[PDB]
Amino acid sequence: MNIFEMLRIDEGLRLKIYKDTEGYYTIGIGHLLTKSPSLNAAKSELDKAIGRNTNGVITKDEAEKLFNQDVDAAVRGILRNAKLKPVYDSLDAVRRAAAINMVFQMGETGVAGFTNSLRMLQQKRWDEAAVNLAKSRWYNQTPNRAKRVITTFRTGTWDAYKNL
Ligand code: NA
């Protein structure tokens, strides 16, 4: 297990434009296209991202290319964020994957607002952090995925992703 395999489990792989859990146009391995309700706007974003006129459909290689870029962007984002970087730096590599997963799903600004959770993580108060992380819109809206990510923060193991 690693961050790529983890997010592949959590996000799936779809080669045609679909709506994500929030109703937003997405493609590939959780590549958010736009929050606009316009499918045409989403198709434009896709074409811009891929560099060709798609039919709203991409190949697996293209999906994996966007995915690589998106994981890299999530990491880069954490490292540029004054609130997230110190917490991320304090973590072991397994818990760093859980951190990247959160940012991939909700964005840097959204995760940086988990102030109390972040403090508990930096303190290595894992059970307390896990309880706090679950008191969130995140957990309520995507409880199975959040439970997996939270278990990863709680334990520093890949146990929530084994059998998957
Ligand atoms: Na998804």
Side-chain angles (χ1 to χ4, degrees), residues 22-38:
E22 292 294 334
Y24 302 136
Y25 293 119
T26 298
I27 199 161
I29 306 167
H31 182 81
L32 175 64
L33 291 163
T34 182
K35 291 182 182 176
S36 167
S38 168

Side-chain angles (χ1 to χ4, degrees), residues 37-51:
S38 168
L39 178 59
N40 281 334
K43 281 174 180 188
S44 181
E45 290 297 314
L46 178 57
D47 291 351
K48 175 164 63 85
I50 301 297

Side-chain angles (χ1 to χ4, degrees), residues 13 34-35 39-40 44 61 72 78 83 88 98 102:
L13 170 63
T34 182
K35 291 182 182 176
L39 178 59
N40 281 334
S44 181
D61 284 2
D72 200 22
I78 288 166
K83 293 166 184 67
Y88 182 86
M102 289 188 79

Side-chain angles (χ1 to χ4, degrees), residues 50-70:
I50 301 297
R52 65 181 181 87
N53 202 352
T54 69
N55 63 154
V57 181
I58 63 175
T59 67
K60 186 172 182 177
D61 284 2
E62 286 169 342
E64 288 173 343
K65 181 177 180 68
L66 295 179
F67 182 45
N68 277 323
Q69 290 176 170
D70 292 346

Side-chain angles (χ1 to χ4, degrees), residues 92-149:
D92 58 277
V94 177
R95 294 187 172 91
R96 285 179 181 161
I100 297 161
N101 193 308
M102 289 188 79
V103 169
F104 190 103
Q105 186 184 358
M106 70 180 78
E108 164 206 342
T109 304
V111 183
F114 276 69
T115 305
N116 304 318
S117 310
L118 291 165
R119 184 190 293 106
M120 297 177 194
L121 292 169
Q122 190 164 346
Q123 291 172 136
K124 304 194 179 297
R125 288 158 63 169
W126 307 124
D127 283 24
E128 285 168 278
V131 167
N132 191 262
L133 284 161
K135 293 174 181 173
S136 62
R137 179 179 189 277
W138 174 49
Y139 175 93
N140 279 278
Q141 299 306 133
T142 55
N144 285 351
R145 194 231 183 110
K147 284 169 180 180
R148 288 193 292 276
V149 173

Side-chain angles (χ1 to χ4, degrees), residues 7 10-14 18-21 26-31 104 145:
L7 277 166
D10 286 335
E11 298 291 351
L13 170 63
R14 299 183 69 181
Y18 65 97
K19 291 180 182 180
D20 73 8
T21 64
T26 298
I27 199 161
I29 306 167
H31 182 81
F104 190 103
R145 194 231 183 110

